[PDB]
Nucleic acid binder design. Structure first.
Length: 288
DNA sequence: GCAGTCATG
DNA sequence: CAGACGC
């Protein structure tokens, strides 16, 4: 927890913002040796193109700003690093507009943001590896993968970079399965890893999001749900909804993934925030 | 044995 | 919209 660098930067955000929740969420998914999450602290390895280093982010609730510290190897691409922190944390969100449009759904915890990511591909590996297993299990799994294919930091030994598209699309489907996953999955990872490497997987949010999710589901191992969750956490698309998610339909007693799909049009263009809310707001119940 | 989610008709 | 693949 000592400064990892001499440069510090300041990112403003619009209140309200539940940082305690945000960090909780990230800490449950923290890939061991890649990220370190504490009380009001978040660190991780980071590669921006060819540059390498470490970010820490520390929230300052009273001044409503986020404090960012960069390792020296990341200084030349600080502007881009901050952009990743902004998308990781959903800092450009206008909560009044969102919670206004969520009405009653937003009232209980207005400081809910959309937990994003730093690298679209990285989220990709996660969205897959997170399939069919507890948040916690995915984390241990992702730890074993990273440790194997991750690239260590020259100046922060204790830290390792999330595996690149390069070293991962070259992974042996058999070495993957051993870390503790079906073979079919090991291939999805490799197929994804290859998409990124040509350019078939969009690294930023596409213009027609709805049409790019279509394209995604063709990928092996990637169904409607995984493609959705990925657009959300991966492209930080704010108008996305999981009518077929189980925990959701558990709140819509006896309804079709179409009876719901339409109910959630009353929350356009902020369906993603609607989704997040219903999930982490247990006391909520729909309008009959 | 029960679900969850990724596949085809 | 209506079969095959870890608790």
């Amino acid at each position: 927890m000592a400064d990892i660098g001499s440069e510090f930067y300041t990112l403003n955000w619009q209140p309200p913002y539940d940082w305690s929740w945000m960090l909780g969420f990230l800490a449950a998914r923290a890939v061991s040796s890649v990220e370190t999450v504490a009380d009001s602290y978040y660190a991780r390895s980071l590669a921006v193109g060819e540059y390498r280093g470490v970010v820490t982010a520390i929230p300052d609730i009273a001044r409503h700003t986020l404090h960012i510290n960069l390792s020296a190897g990341l200084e030349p691409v600080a502007a881009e690093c901050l952009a990743k922190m902004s998308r990781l944390f959903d800092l450009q969100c206008n909560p009044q507009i969102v919670n206004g449009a969520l009405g009653r759904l937003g009232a209980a915890r207005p400081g809910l943001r959309l937990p994003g990511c730093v690298d679209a591909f990285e989220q990709g590996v996660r969205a897959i590896l997170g399939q069919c297993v507890s948040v916690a299990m995915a984390a241990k799994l992702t730890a074993r993968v990273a440790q194997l294919y991750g690239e260590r930091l020259d100046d922060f030994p204790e830290y390792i970079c999330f595996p690149t598209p390069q070293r991962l699309a070259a992974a042996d489907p058999q070495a993957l399965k051993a870390l503790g996953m079906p073979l079919k999955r090991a291939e999805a990872l490799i197929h994804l890893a290859n998409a990124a490497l040509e350019g078939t997987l969009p690294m930023t949010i596409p213009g027609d999001v709805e049409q790019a999710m279509k394209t995604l589901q063709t990928f092996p191992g990637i169904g409607r749900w995984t493609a959705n969750y990925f657009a959300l956490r991966g492209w930080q698309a704010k108008d996305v909804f999981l009518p077929d998610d189980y925990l959701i339909k558990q709140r819509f007693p006896g309804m079709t993934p179409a009876q719901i799909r339409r109910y959630a049009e009353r929350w356009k263009p902020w369906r993603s925030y609607a989704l997040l809310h219903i999930w982490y707001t247990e006391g909520w119940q729909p309008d009959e």
